[PDB]
Every structure is written in C-alpha cells, then in structure tokens.
Design a binder for this molecule. Structure first.
Ligand SMILES: Cc1cc(CNCCS(C)(=O)=O)ccc1Br
Length: 330
C-alpha cells in the first residue's frame, strides 16, 4: 500500500503545515500537523475543555462506529516551546492520503495549552518520530507510520514541504519526479527517539564550506532551523544590523536586508536554503525589525533541522530495520 497527501502552510510565513487526516467511520477529517519530532497522534475532540477550543475542528468518538475507548490509557505531552496537551485514548481507523490503519491510537485532548487554542488552523498533531517517545500510559502506543509500515510497499515516508506553497507527504514510496539529482542517505541514531543525524558542515552565502559535525534532528513540527551559537553568529554576522535580542527572543534583522543563503552538508552533498526562506517577517505588525529563521539551539540541548531547512529538500525518512535519512535537492 501507499498514501499521498498534500500539506499546506497555516499562514503566509510557513509557521507550520497542516495535512488532512480521516479519522473514524464515517470519516471525520481533521487537519493535523505532521511532526517528525514527536510520537503522539492527538486531536482536539468533543472532550476538550470548551474554553480551550477556538475554531478547531474536533473529533467526536461517539459519532464513529469504529471508535473504541482504550480503557485506562491516558497521555500527557509537553513540547520544547512550553506547550502541552493531555487526555485519554481511543482506537479508531485513520487514513492519510488513501493509506488506512485500523486500530490506531487517537489521543483525545481534554486539555491543551494556550498556544494550541490560539491556533484555529491546527486540529492536532500526528507524530512521526519513533514510537519509543509515545506518551500513552500504561501501554505505550505506536505511531501511524509504525502501524502502517508492514503494509507499505517500502518502509518509508517522505516530506516535501513547500516554501510559501503546498507540498506533499508520501508513505510507502519515493516519488522520483519530486527531486533533482540523487538522494544522499545518512545514518540515523534512534537513541533519543528522534530522526537524529549528523550534518557534515555549513556555508554562509557564497562563503567557503566549513567541514564540521553537527548532530541534530529532522523535525517537521519545528518552524525554524536551530543550530549551535557559533554557526548562527557566523550567519547573522553577514547581515548588516542583525543582532540577537533577548527582549524578542532571538536574532532579528532589518526588514530592508537581503539575506544570504545557508548551506548544510549531507555527507558529500549540500542542501542550499535560499535567503528568502530565512525571513520570518516583522516581529510585530508594522515593525521594521524582522525575525530570523536561523536561531541558536544553545537553550534547547539539541540542534533542530526544522521546516526552514527541510523545505529546501526532498527528505526521505527510511524506517527500515536500520533507519536512515535521505536528502535531495528539488
Ligand atoms: C504547532 C505546534 C507544534 C509543536 C510540536 N513541535 C514543537 C517543536 S519545539 C522545538 O518548539 O519544541 C508544538 C507546539 C505547537 Br503550537
């Protein structure tokens, strides 16, 4: 089997991407944030505290003939940005882009943090990191990908995120029309439950490439590119007037600037992030200070190749017995 679904930016800045997902019978379509940095499929629901719902579509298990309470199971997750949600668990039929899993754990939110209530465009998350991070207790649950894997034509999914445009998530096959050149594969460590890999270095604009190992994770559910402070300082030093602002919470730059590109290494290959991808626009409406898309990881404990980086590539998440990542230009 295979599946293929379009993923669409939630706003003009590409802060996140939403993908329609069918849950239940008859289908209830929710727009979920596919997150390769977490392992819970959770949704706004008929159980979510009413004051915490503001425009999201909800899953109502009582309307699904295939929904079963997963008796006694609860979940609770906290994300690197301070956000959280928690609740109870149903099993139900979940389909993505024509690929169906029966008995998927669908984590129904009772509580969500402010950051979720205030995003009417995101009806929940679909985690695609390793199932070892799943937060369901007392019986940990599998991701949609792990449940689908055995049925797929190839144990892979691919992320093809657009810059200010829709893109695609495919499951079970590699669309050889979707990229240019060849795919470079690189080793993955699953020790922290992430798609963790080691970049071979970086360049800023037309500068020389610096060969240096940068461990990090491929994370579709993080907007920006978070890298070591040394790397990030070297980038923003090439932008007149850029500075780190503790008041704003990262590097800002004059909105009048033209940003340089940023290249990262994948083995002997190179992925180039155009400068425009690193512009996240005014810090507040009408400001002439703009927020940067490359930020320091210093206050995180991990480097994160988020959407700024991933949208510059066709990315293969190879879930074979020995997992690997692949990157191609596009
Ligand atoms: C939309 C959304 C997604 C996620 C999942 N990714 C979080 C990545 S980080 C580096 O910020 O911890 C959290 C919160 C919101 Br709000």
């Amino acid at each position: 089997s295979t599946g293929s679904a379009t993923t669409t930016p939630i706003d003009s800045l590409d802060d996140a991407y939403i993908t329609p997902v069918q849950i239940g019978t008859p289908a209830q379509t929710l727009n979920l944030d596919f997150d390769t940095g977490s392992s819970d499929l959770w949704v706004f629901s008929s159980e979510t505290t009413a004051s915490e719902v503001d425009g999201q579509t909800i899953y109502t298990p009582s309307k699904s003939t295939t929904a079963k309470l997963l008796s006694g199971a609860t979940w609770s997750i906290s994300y690197g940005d301070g956000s959280s949600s928690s609740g109870d668990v149903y099993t139900d039929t979940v389909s993505v882009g024509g690929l169906t899993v029966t008995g998927q754990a669908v984590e129904s939110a009772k509580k969500v943090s402010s950051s979720f209530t205030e995003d009417s465009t995101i009806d929940g998350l679909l985690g695609l990191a390793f199932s070892t991070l799943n937060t369901v207790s007392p019986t940990q649950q599998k991701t949609f990908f792990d449940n689908a894997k055995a049925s797929l034509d190839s144990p892979v999914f691919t992320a093809d995120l657009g810059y200010h445009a829709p893109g695609t998530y495919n499951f079970g096959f590699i669309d050889t029309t979707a990229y240019t050149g060849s795919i470079t594969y690189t080793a993955v460590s699953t020790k922290q439950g992430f798609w963790e890999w080691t970049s071979t270095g970086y360049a800023v604009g037309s500068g020389t490439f610096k060969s240096t190992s940068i461990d990090g994770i491929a994370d579709t559910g993080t907007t920006l590119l978070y890298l070591p402070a040394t790397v990030v300082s070297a980038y923003w030093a090439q932008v007149s007037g850029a500075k780190s602002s503790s008041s704003v919470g990262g590097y800002v730059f004059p909105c009048s600037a033209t940003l340089p590109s940023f290249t990262f290494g994948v083995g002997s290959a190179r992925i180039v992030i155009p400068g425009d991808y690193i512009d996240f626009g005014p810090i507040s409406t009408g400001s002439s200070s703009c927020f940067g898309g490359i930020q320091s990881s210093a206050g995180i404990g991990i480097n994160i190749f988020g959407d700024v980086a991933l949208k510059a590539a066709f990315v293969v998440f190879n879930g074979a017995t020995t997992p690997t990542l692949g990157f191609a230009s596009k």
